[PDB]
């Protein structure tokens, strides 16, 4: 590929794994399982599924904070993800279990009255999925009913987004690892939230 007989077109592919020690890296394994890795020890597994693991409406996030048994690196990631969901209002949609320091967060992306006109451009999923799409951006589009051309009415066939702590393993089968998803969300978090109290 020698252009004009003078300029060779050459390529470069970056190994972003060398960045694991200072910043989280995310990748896609397949349509339902996506990952965020931290260093060479841990990270989060983000699964789009039809099976719940939490079957209650408690979270007790404030208890987790007092006890301080969780890995701070992972709680930081969860906080960035949650605050990057635009217009979150349906608080019952999220439930969690931090028992023992383990991290487990479940969003219910199920939409009530689905057969009421399109009725699919304001539900939580329309958000949670947008946030997800960014967190695992290198390959997340494969998991959506429509990967692109639709920003506001994004839907998937999966009913729950479950985010759980996972040990480090090489799961980057669909896409390379990249720090970009996480880094992008850091400037979006809290930018578009609703007020729940007169004094925030």
């Amino acid at each position: 590929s020698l252009y004009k007989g003078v300029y060779e077109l050459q390529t470069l592919e970056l190994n972003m794994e060398t960045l694991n020690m200072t910043m989280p890296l995310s990748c896609t394994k397949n349509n339902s399982h996506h990952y965020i890795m931290v260093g060479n020890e841990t990270g989060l597994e983000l699964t789009l599924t039809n099976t719940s693991i939490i079957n209650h409406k408690f979270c007790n996030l404030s208890d987790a904070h007092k006890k301080n048994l969780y890995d701070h690196a992972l709680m930081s990631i969860i906080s960035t993800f949650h605050l990057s969901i635009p217009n979150f209002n349906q608080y019952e949609a999220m439930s969690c279990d931090f028992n023992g320091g383990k991290i487990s967060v479940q969003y219910n992306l199920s939409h009530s009255y689905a057969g009421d006109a399109a009725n699919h451009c304001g539900t939580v999923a329309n958000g949670v999925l947008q946030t997800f799409m960014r967190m695992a951006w290198g390959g997340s589009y494969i998991a959506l009913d429509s990967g692109c051309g639709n920003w506001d009415c994004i839907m998937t066939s999966y009913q729950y987004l479950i985010i759980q702590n996972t040990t480090w393993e090489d799961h980057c089968q669909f896409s390379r690892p990249s720090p970009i998803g996480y880094l992008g969300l850091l400037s979006q978090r809290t930018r578009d939230i609703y007020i729940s109290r007169r004094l925030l």
Binding site: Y7, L12, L14, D71, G184
Partner: protein
């Protein structure tokens, strides 16, 4: 706002080592290309150089923590990258137009001088990379830019 981080000097330019590339050993870039990263706010390649250079300095200069910490990278993000390039490529993906996913770059290399252009991101579309015949306009623009620069070098 704007980036401020200065890349560690190579005597001029910048070079990536073998562990930074996918099976490509080492690649060094000339100072006249690297220097453009101090002026541009729209180059995905330059932002990656800053994240890697940061990673290296943090590892070599700070005492390792008992456990990995994310505080340092969060503080440094804006100093190192233009976050609006993540937003840009996000917008391009949702609007169905080719965009940079940051893993692959390309550049032109003059065969008799060994000088290269600053790398541009190889774009993707329907889950895969576009063709030299799809972004042929950018390849040709880079060739023209290099020609102008080679002529200026001969003049000076």
């Amino acid at each position: 706002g704007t980036f401020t981080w200065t890349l560690s000097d190579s005597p001029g330019g910048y070079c990536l080592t073998r562990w930074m590339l996918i099976e490509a050993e080492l690649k060094c870039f000339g100072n006249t290309a690297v220097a453009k990263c101090n002026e541009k706010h729209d180059e995905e390649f330059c932002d990656m150089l800053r994240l890697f250079d940061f990673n290296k300095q943090a590892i070599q200069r700070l005492k390792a923590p008992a456990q990995m910490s994310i505080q340092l990278i969060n503080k440094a993000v804006n100093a190192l990258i233009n976050d609006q390039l993540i937003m840009k490529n996000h917008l391009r993906d949702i609007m169905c137009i080719p965009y940079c996913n940051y893993s692959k770059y390309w550049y032109l290399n003059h065969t008799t001088t060994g000088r290269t252009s600053l790398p541009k991101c190889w774009l993707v579309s329907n889950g895969s990379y576009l063709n030299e015949t799809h972004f042929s306009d950018d390849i040709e623009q880079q060739a023209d830019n290099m020609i102008t620069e080679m002529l200026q070098k001969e003049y000076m």
